[PDB]
Amino acid sequence: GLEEFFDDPKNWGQEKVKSGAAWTCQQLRNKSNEDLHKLWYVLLKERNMLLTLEQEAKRQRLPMPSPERLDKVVDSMDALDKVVQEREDALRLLQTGQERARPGAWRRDIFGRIIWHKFKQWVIPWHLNKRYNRKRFFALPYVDHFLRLEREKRARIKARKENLERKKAKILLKKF
Amino acid sequence: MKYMVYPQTFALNADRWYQYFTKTVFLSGLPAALRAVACDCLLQEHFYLRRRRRVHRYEESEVISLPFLDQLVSTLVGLLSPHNPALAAAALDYRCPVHFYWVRGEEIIPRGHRRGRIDDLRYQIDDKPNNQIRISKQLAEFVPLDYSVPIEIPTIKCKPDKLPLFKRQYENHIFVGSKTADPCCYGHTQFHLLPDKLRRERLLRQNCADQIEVVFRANAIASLFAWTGAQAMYQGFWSEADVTRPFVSQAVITDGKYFSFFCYQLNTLALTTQADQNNPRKNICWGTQSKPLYETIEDNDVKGFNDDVLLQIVHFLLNRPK
Amino acid sequence: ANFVSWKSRTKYTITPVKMRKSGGRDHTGRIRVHGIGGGHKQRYRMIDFLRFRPEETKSGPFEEKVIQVRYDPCRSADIALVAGGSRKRWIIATENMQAGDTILNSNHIGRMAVAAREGDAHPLGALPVGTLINNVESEPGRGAQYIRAAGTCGVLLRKVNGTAIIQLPSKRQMQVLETCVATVGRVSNVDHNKRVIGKAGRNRWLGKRPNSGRWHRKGGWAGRKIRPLPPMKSYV
Amino acid sequence: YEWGVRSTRKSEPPPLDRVYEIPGLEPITFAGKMHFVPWLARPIFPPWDRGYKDPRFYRSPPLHEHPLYKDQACYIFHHRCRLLEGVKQALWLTKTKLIEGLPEKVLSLVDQDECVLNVISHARLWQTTEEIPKRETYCPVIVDNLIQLCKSQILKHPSLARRICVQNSTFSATWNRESLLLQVRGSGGARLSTKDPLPTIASREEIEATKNHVLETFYPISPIIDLHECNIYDVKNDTGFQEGYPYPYPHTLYLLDKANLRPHRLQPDQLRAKMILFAFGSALAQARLLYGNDAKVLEQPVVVQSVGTDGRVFHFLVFQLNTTDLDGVKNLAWVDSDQLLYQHFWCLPVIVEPVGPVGFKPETFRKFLALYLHGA
Amino acid sequence: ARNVVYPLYRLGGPQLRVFRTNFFIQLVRPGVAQPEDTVQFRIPMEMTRVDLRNYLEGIYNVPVAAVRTRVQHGSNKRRDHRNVRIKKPDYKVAYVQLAHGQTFTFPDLFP
Amino acid sequence: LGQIYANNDKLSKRLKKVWKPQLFEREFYSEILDKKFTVTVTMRTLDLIDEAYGLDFYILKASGEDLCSKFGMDLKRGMLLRLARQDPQLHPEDPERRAAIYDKYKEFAIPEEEAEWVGLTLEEAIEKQRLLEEKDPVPLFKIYVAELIQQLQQQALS
Amino acid sequence: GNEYQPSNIKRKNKHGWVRRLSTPAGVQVILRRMLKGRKSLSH
Amino acid sequence: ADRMSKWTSKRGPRSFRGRKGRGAKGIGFLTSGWRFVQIKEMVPEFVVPDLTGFKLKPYVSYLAPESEETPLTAAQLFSEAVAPAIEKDGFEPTQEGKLFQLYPRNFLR
RNA sequence: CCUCCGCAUAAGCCUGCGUCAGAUCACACUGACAAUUAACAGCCCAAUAUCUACAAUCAACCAACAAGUCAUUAUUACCCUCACUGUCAACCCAACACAGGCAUGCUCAUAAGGAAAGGUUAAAAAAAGUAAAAGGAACUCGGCAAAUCUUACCCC
RNA sequence: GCUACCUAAGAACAGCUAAGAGCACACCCGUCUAUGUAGCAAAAUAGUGGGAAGAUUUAUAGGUAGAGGCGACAAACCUA
RNA sequence: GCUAAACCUAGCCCCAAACCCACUCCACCUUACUACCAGCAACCUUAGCCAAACCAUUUACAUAAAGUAUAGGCGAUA
Ligand SMILES: [Mg+2]
Ligand SMILES: [Mg+2]
Ligand SMILES: [Mg+2]
Ligand SMILES: [Mg+2]
Ligand SMILES: [Mg+2]
Ligand SMILES: [Mg+2]
Ligand SMILES: [Mg+2]
Ligand SMILES: [Mg+2]
Ligand SMILES: [Mg+2]
Ligand SMILES: [Mg+2]
Ligand SMILES: [Mg+2]
Ligand SMILES: [Mg+2]
Ligand SMILES: [Mg+2]
Ligand SMILES: [Mg+2]
């Protein structure tokens, strides 16, 4: 029912509602995948409800009753995501021995800076793909100069940073 | 710019809204050779007639059904020309358009440079009735001019735009199957087929199973009403110069299996707020629920063929202008 | 500079093909030919200039019926719709050719030297000396390139060995192989020459933009040149 | 000469890298990577084919290997096929005789106009919302109206109840001639079907008479000329219905000629020819259905009618089909060519002339009525 | 799920599953005074009408009769101490009709 | 690509000039490759070939900087490879012939691994290297299993 | 005045990222923009 | 003509506006007379579990004690399925013939 | 009292007089909060072959010329249905809340849509209009401008 | 994206007289006068005019670019 | 007495030393920031201002030898 998008009717108009802590990583880590899935859906609905409440508050010009709870929920969700993801990664490592799922290949584009070109997934092979051969992954001589310039710029910035730090240190020393 | 009314609408609870727009009262119920012919018609398209190119579900209601419907119309008419001499004289139109333009209600303009200005909000029903039978003599009355029937019309608690209903500005159009220079200005049996969008299977798939009948009802309310309006216009009559006669017309929407039967009673064109204030009149519509003309076809044999449906059709056809 | 030439139709057809205008611009997009453009819209009728080509899986001399004689917007001469056997085609119309008429196409290099009629095509070897001809090929099987304009004609001057000598519409003369085809008579729409344009508007319609205002001085070239005719050119 | 032009023919592939000629080393190419590179040689990949079979990117086999490709070229007729000539060509194809007037029986079966006028008016002005309806609208409409009017005599004639006009009605018929194979395909027009067959117009003596006059030759415009030359044709003939369909007997082919442009429409002779062909084809199909597939001179010659097209002009045709063995006696069609109700309709008035039709002649209408009646 | 690579469906392979949904929603009071049975949600831009229908039916066990989405432009005309255009985010609104004459009035929170 | 003074006085005008070699197109049979290569070949190249007698010899002898072409380099590499492998260029029925051919070029003939890399660009070389050491990443699970096995063995020993 | 007559399609065809990437000059333009650190590198 | 503002589906002309979309992800293809073909398999159906009789609430009591964190590496996982190996003294060589592929992911989320 | 203007669509722009709260010619300016729902319109169409002579002009006569804008067919291939986007506004290009510029469809006095006059006075000079005795081009470079109109003749 | 010219594929032209015809709307241009001349405006307003079924006007998309383009030469126009 | 004045510390400059930068997910060469279908490809002396009081050959781009030998409208200058 749509009553799931709102909390307990008792809690409407309290200014403060009791919500005890977020799911920590270790606890989450120790629950099972089936359990975890179930937990996710429980979390989700709660999150939705919180969002709705927030929206209502905004509409009303009134402050939230217990906004920290939403944050906690979010944190919990994040933790859950991390745990499951970690597990998946581990599994992948065990099976194929691959870091990440979605593959790439460290490709040097037009502008010469090396992109992690994440692969896009589709039906025909590359050599008879019209829109992918026009995507060029090589520099040509004019780019090198620009790269050099960029590098120089970067170096300048670095120098500025370093010198500034030193100056600050000196100032501090002088003070104390 | 006017609210573009669609008789065969996907909108839910469209009926009440439609009624409000029109100002109707809807009510339940009405105010062997033939059978064989019907069976033959059913068969022809579904079996006997060999298709060249392959038939598809998107292509089903166009290719199979409309022609069958047409056949039913024409053959039936031929049969009943002895039974009724008016249908011999009466013209018949396949897919010819029907347009009608009314004004129902006021609206203070919400925003812009025209804000806080009275705007009489406009409607238009356009239509292509699968086919229709147009007579020169006007049909009878059904129910008397100014019949009370105290059942009450829907509210319209919110804006017309809240229902899926959209405004546009294109040429205004009040028009029957033909133009003014014509003897055959009246009519008595509009046939519709619902599109592929409002197949009952689709409805079932969606949670809207209560809106199966509703759609048909809405359609009946719309197209018929429009036709009536057109007829009225062609014999003078406005909002202000209200109809003296009761303009009547009948119709039978359908689907390949499922038919239902709808007569319309047009007592008013006085839908503007200027006229409504002193208005005891209201337009009427009576109709049956969608009963299947038949169950199913296996090869070249209908499983169960319903004669009751056929009888209704015959009745609709067979009524005369007094 | 986008420029796909419209001439991309590989298959022969009778149907008239949509013609893109050039304006006198090249594929580079610059004007190479001044004073062109802005005329009436036109469609191309594909003209079969290889007069003796046989219909598919046949070899002998090809008879033809004239179905129609029409105006071609693409050119000065008027054109004829020929039919024969299974196939139809457009040819350039000879003078006086009308619908219903029957035409002959031949490959037959006769030692008899058979006389011919104003519509029909023959090898030059079969044609009597002194007959007027049009749509003359340069080589055998090459296709008819010469004497195609409204009202024009060349005349067969003599035969020497396996070659014939033609006088072109410019009286400059041309030696052509005996077996090369031509069609007897003069090109149709004779008196095209006598047409008076009447107004600038007509000229514009024809797709000819006006001359430039810049006053040029006349130079060395501009005196009249009385010369002998250039030496008869051969293709053997 | 070679039409095509070099630039617009697909670009010639760039020359194969010179390393490939050297036997025998591994050419280092950009197929190791998955992008193009200008240094690094061009790789040569094998011709890819797809494992699964998507209909939305389906590539068919060549005309060499198709499941029913024949070597003898068939020649097939259509609604679109519009033949150079003419009535004569059609006759030749069909093997038949053209008589200048409709038969006497039909005429007799005739022996009022306001209705016709109304119908005409309705088609040419009244039916649509916009002013002046176009031909793709009115031409079929007029015909339909006429048909309806004819039907309105069911009160007069009780036998008219046992018919049905149908719209899609595709069909086929295949035969040899000189001998070259020859085919007809179905309609894009209406078809009046009846339970009883039509009666014979000509006697068996008359048919014997036809033998004397030779079918016209007309060189060099040979048949088959304009018809669609075709391989992969399939020789099986076909009526428009499965077995057991009531109202199976083709009374009149109500085909029509819409097309708002002058070019897309038929020219009248061509139209007539087409009609004749249709008549033959349906008749032939009927004959096939009736008798064996083996050819002969017929005992009962089947009759089919076909009205001509267009809102203005009307070509009537009744076809007798008496010989399923072509290549002796021949068939005998008769036509009333280009008879026409009403010359020109003024949808708007003029500045003097009214807004109705003009030059209305009811003879055409009468003829139509007669045609409709034939069986009863 | 939002911000995820979707697997390719070539022709006759498996049904696409979503275990663990990334997008989450919020039902709101309609300002313009909607009719009975129409519930309005603010939705992530990546979510489809169909997805919304599915999402409600599965997780909330609600009978959805119709869904009509609509993207809403968030305002850009707003500037800072720097005179840089702050943009309100564009967002998607749904108008979801409930089935079987279920009906729904939005509750009075913050009484 | 240079400049010329107009009539070879410096006080006359200076104007740019491009001096082109006189190019040709000619076939060359190469004993080591057993194939006829059509080549763009200047007169100078021909002369060089004549001097070194064989085209193959020229290819071999000519120092990489001297040779002046990518194609030439490639050819040289191929020749080297052939020399190394001792692969059948003349197939069977000509082993003696093959041997004889080989004996013509006992000079040169570098180890098989070096001759692969000969006459390459930098980028090409890099690509080759990449190809050589690409592989699939080995499953960590397998490694773990191996480790476990080792541990077990150790335990058994002790 | 009023020499600008906005039309998005034209603009994108004229000055767009794709057009700049098509030519070496265009590429250089983008590189220049990058080097300056400009926020909008193409149109 | 602001090129600081983000390009979007609202911004162009008619033909431009209908092409783009937001990050919506397509349900099907389109054919014939622009008739769209909603394929069931491309639509993601949400596999929702049964929460009836599920004690895990969305928050965790303050009385619950804290523990030291442990990043779940592959080694640990292996160890947690090393008992069988030990007993002997559970792996795919390829997972191409498999519905749920761990590397080039099929499974959504 | 004006209406030499209105409603739409296209293009363009992109929340730019909607609710509440707030401040400082007269009080569309900031902050929050709402808002535009598809059927209209965008977003198309599996191959290989093979076909497309007869304009448009109420298309009927006439009548032409500058020679034109709307077509299939054969065989093979095929069941899955309505996704995604635009849809606000007093609006765009002209630095401006600028007498300018701005495509098409309707409406041709408007059923739309506006306000020429902050208040007084009634001087000069200036601007726009109307008035005119008698004369009537005498004005002036020239009947320029104006109000009634129309004669004859040169030059290019 | 202004203008110069072109290519593609669209659109508009009432009413009266009777054909690059006449009068005359809408549109196009800009003769002469007055006002304006830091202006309503970096070329406008008011009137008065030339054109207005054509060598016309014009919405959209494309093309030619500087030692060049484009030009019914005015050494015009090529974003004040 | 109003307008205003004033105010150090943001940071920056020049060295030194050391070889830098660059995948939370998703998107991004199609009209970039767009989930999903059958064809091309990069290299080619710099010039001119200017100086020679104009202007055409011509004019630079660790220390010491050395501004030496040489070059050069045998001059500017190199
Ligand atoms: Mg001149
Ligand atoms: Mg609007
Ligand atoms: Mg008003
Ligand atoms: Mg005022
Ligand atoms: Mg004042
Ligand atoms: Mg006076
Ligand atoms: Mg004087
Ligand atoms: Mg004057
Ligand atoms: Mg004129
Ligand atoms: Mg005029
Ligand atoms: Mg000009
Ligand atoms: Mg001059
Ligand atoms: Mg100097
Ligand atoms: Mg000087």
Curated annotation (Swiss-Prot), chain B:
Family statement: Belongs to the mitochondrion-specific ribosomal protein mL65 family.
Protein name: Large ribosomal subunit protein mL65
Tissues where the protein occurs: Heart, skeletal muscle, kidney and liver. Lower expression in placenta and peripheral blood leukocytes.
Annotated gene: MRPS30
Any GO BP: mitochondrial translation
Subunit structure: Component of the mitochondrial large ribosomal subunit (mt-LSU). Mature mammalian 55S mitochondrial ribosomes consist of a small (28S) and a large (39S) subunit. The 28S small subunit contains a 12S ribosomal RNA (12S mt-rRNA) and 30 different proteins. The 39S large subunit contains a 16S rRNA (16S mt-rRNA), a copy of mitochondrial valine transfer RNA (mt-tRNA(Val)), which plays an integral structural role, and 52 different proteins. mL65 forms a heterodimer with mL37.
Paired cysteines (S-S): none
Keywords (A to Z) from UniProt: Mitochondrion, Ribonucleoprotein, Ribosomal protein
Cellular component per GO, a single term: mitochondrial inner membrane
Any one GO MF annotation of this record: RNA binding
Location(s) in or outside the cell: Mitochondrion
Main location: mitochondrion
UniProtKB/Swiss-Prot annotation, chain D:
Mitochondrion among keywords: yes
Keyword Endoplasmic reticulum among record annotations: no
Compartments reported by the entry: Mitochondrion
Regions crossing the membrane: none
GO cellular component: mitochondrial inner membrane; mitochondrial large ribosomal subunit; mitochondrial ribosome; mitochondrion
One of the Pfam families matching this protein, by short name: PDCD9
Top-level taxonomic group: Eukaryota
Keyword annotations from UniProtKB, A to Z: Mitochondrion, Ribonucleoprotein, Ribosomal protein, Transit peptide
GO biological process: mitochondrial translation; translation
Disulfide feature: none
UniProt GO MF annotations: RNA binding; structural constituent of ribosome
Family: Belongs to the mitochondrion-specific ribosomal protein mL37 family.
Protein name: Large ribosomal subunit protein mL37
Originating species: Homo sapiens
Designated gene of the protein: MRPL37
From Swiss-Prot, chain E:
Subunit field text: Component of the mitochondrial large ribosomal subunit (mt-LSU). Mature mammalian 55S mitochondrial ribosomes consist of a small (28S) and a large (39S) subunit. The 28S small subunit contains a 12S ribosomal RNA (12S mt-rRNA) and 30 different proteins. The 39S large subunit contains a 16S rRNA (16S mt-rRNA), a copy of mitochondrial valine transfer RNA (mt-tRNA(Val)), which plays an integral structural role, and 52 different proteins.
Name of the featured protein: Large ribosomal subunit protein uL23m
Family note: Belongs to the universal ribosomal protein uL23 family.
Encoding gene, per UniProt annotation: MRPL23
A single GO cellular-component term on record: fibrillar center
Domain of life assignment: Eukaryota
Annotated source species: Homo sapiens
GO biological process: mitochondrial translation; translation
Keywords assigned by UniProt, alphabetized: Mitochondrion, Ribonucleoprotein, Ribosomal protein
This protein's record includes keyword Endoplasmic reticulum: no
Molecular function terms, GO-annotated: RNA binding; structural constituent of ribosome
Subcellular location: Mitochondrion
Positions in coiled-coil regions: none
Shown stretch of the complete protein: 2 to 112 of 153
Curated annotation (Swiss-Prot), chain H:
Localization, UniProt: Mitochondrion
Reported tissue expression: Present in kidney, liver, thymus and testis, and at lower level in brain and spleen (at protein level).
GO biological process: apoptotic process; mitochondrial translation; translation
InterPro entries: Ribosomal_mL41 (IPR019189)
CC per GO annotation: mitochondrial inner membrane; mitochondrial large ribosomal subunit; mitochondrion; ribonucleoprotein complex
Pfam families: MRP-L27
Major subcellular site: mitochondrion
Keywords on record: Apoptosis, Cell cycle, Mitochondrion, Ribonucleoprotein, Ribosomal protein, Transit peptide
GO molecular function, one term: structural constituent of ribosome
Keyword Lyase: no
Keyword Plastid tagged: no
Subunit structure: Component of the mitochondrial large ribosomal subunit (mt-LSU). Mature mammalian 55S mitochondrial ribosomes consist of a small (28S) and a large (39S) subunit. The 28S small subunit contains a 12S ribosomal RNA (12S mt-rRNA) and 30 different proteins. The 39S large subunit contains a 16S rRNA (16S mt-rRNA), a copy of mitochondrial valine transfer RNA (mt-tRNA(Val)), which plays an integral structural role, and 52 different proteins. Interacts with BCL2.
Entry's family note: Belongs to the mitochondrion-specific ribosomal protein mL41 family.
Name assigned to this protein: Large ribosomal subunit protein mL41
Native source organism of the sequence: Homo sapiens
